[PDB]
Amino acid sequence: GQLNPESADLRALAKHLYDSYIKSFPLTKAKARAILTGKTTDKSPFVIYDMNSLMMGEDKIEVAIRIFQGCQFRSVEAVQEITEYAKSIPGFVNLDLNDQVTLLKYGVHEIIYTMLASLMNKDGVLISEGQGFMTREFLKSLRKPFGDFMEPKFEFAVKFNALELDDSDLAIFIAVIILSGDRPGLLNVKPIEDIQDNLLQALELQLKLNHPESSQLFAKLLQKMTDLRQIVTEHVQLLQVIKKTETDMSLHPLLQEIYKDLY
Amino acid sequence: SNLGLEDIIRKALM
Numbered sequence: 033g034q035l036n037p038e039s040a041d042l043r044a045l046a047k048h049l050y051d052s053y054i055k056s057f058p059l060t061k062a063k064a065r066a067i068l069t070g071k072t073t074d075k076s077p078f079v080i081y082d083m084n085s086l087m088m089g090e091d092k093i094e095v096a097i098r099i100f101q102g103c104q105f106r107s108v109e110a111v112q113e114i115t116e117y118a119k120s121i122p123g124f125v126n127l128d129l130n131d132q133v134t135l136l137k138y139g140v141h142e143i144i145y146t147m148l149a150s151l152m153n154k155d156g157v158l159i160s161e162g163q164g165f166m167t168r169e170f171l172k173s174l175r176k177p178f179g180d181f182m183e184p185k186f187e188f189a190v191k192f193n194a195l196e197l198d199d200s201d202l203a204i205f206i207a208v209i210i211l212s213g214d215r216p217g218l219l220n221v222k223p224i225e226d227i228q229d230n231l232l233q234a235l236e237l238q239l240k241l242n243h244p245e246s247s248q249l250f251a252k253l254l255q256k257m258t259d260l261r262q263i264v265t266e267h268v269q270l271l272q273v274i275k276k277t278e279t280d281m282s283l284h285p286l287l288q289e290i291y292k293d294l295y
Numbered sequence: 296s297n298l299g300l301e302d303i304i305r306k307a308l309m
């Protein structure tokens with residue numbers, strides 16, 4: 033590596049994306065980690081870890097289809113923020129509009145799961161705008177099919193969070209996800225790969241500068257896209273599990289509202 | 296939904 037005009041341009045791109053990311057996403061990874069590690073004394077979340085504490089937290093808060101309808105509605109803001117971020121990626125708004133929509137309609141789910149990992153640690157997930165913390169084992173204990181909804185996302189998040197990415201890293205990673213030339217139905221793949229090539233160069237440099245501890249972090253991070261893609265693909269099978277579940281699927285109303293905060 | 300999601304994205308790109 034040398035400090036030359038192209039490397040400076042890649043640093044300017046990384047900065048541009050970081051600044052846009054801060055402007056687009058009010059809830060950053062740093063803010064979420066500060067809550068999770070016990071430093072946002074302004075907002076100490078209530079811990080929901082069993083049915084008893086679930087009822088004690090009442091003031092702070094088909095069934096499964098209604099959950100999905102509700103979490104999709106609550107994710108509209110995230111979709112809008114991700115779309116606003118995408119407009120800042122140099123070259124993106126010059127693409128064929130159909131390709132912009134295609135890139136976003138596939139990319140937003142992978143990006144939402146990436147951002148969900150910031151809200152998670154091995155014990156649980158922030159909910160209710162950081163005012164609450166829902167434990168992983170309590171979610172896992174819930175009757176089928178609900179108890180299986182979130183555990184694969186926790187498994188992913190622990191592995192993903194072990195990379196110790198910060199918001200500057202994530203800004204470039206999210207842009208790389210958006211500019212994926214492999215999305216089905218794309219009309220003009222080459223201009224998308226031209227931008228992604230630039231973003232990948234910027235990510236590779238960002239990770240080398242920012243993570244001296246982690247020699248193949250670029251490759252490990254790109255491999256995390258396989259897990260993101262698996263989780264997204266599986267959501268179609270959650271829908272089939274629900275159709276075929278002959279059992280009772282009632283769920284405490286407050287648990288229904290907590291699930292609407294998830295994805 | 297997919298059609299609902301596409302419409303959200305299209306409006307947001309406006």
Ligand SMILES: *c1ccc([N+](=O)[O-])cc1C(=O)Nc1cncc(F)c1
Nearest residue numbers: 099100103141181264267291294295
């Ligand atoms: C919303 C709320 C809770 C869950 N969950 O516990 O699994 C999932 C969802 C949901 O609708 N997820 C989703 C929606 N559209 C696309 C996806 F890839 C995932």
